């Protein structure tokens, strides 16, 4: 479970840095919505899942 | 910080200044649009 704690945490930072840059570049981009739109939706979903995973496993490390 | 998070204690030293940079970025942006 500790390996999982370390990689879920390592995924959250990476995903956060990507979302932090990507989400505003896509929102202000032109047609780049047909892409980004659905990719932002579950980028938002997986981010929430990653926060929860890290928070749960934190009590097992 | 709990030792399982000691890996980020360099990142913590920087975090509180991030809001200031937000003030600075609005100038980068207005500079990029020529005010």
């Amino acid at each position: 479970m500790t390996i999982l704690f370390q990689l879920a945490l390592a995924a959250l930072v990476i995903l956060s840095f990507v979302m932090v840059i990507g989400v505003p570049v896509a929102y202000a981009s032109p047609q780049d919505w047909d892409r980004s739109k659905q990719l932002i939706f579950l980028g938002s979903g997986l981010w929430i899942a990653l926060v929860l995973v890290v928070g749960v496993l934190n009590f097992f490390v | 910080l709990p030792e399982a998070y000691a890996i980020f204690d360099p990142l913590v030293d920087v975090l509180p200044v991030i809001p200031v940079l937000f003030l600075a970025l609005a100038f980068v942006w207005q500079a990029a649009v020529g005010f």
Partner: peptide
Amino acid sequence: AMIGIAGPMIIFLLAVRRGNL
């Protein structure tokens, strides 16, 4: 440093792609 440039990076990418600056 990486967190510092993330800011100006957004303004660069939005000017290369003709974004809504």
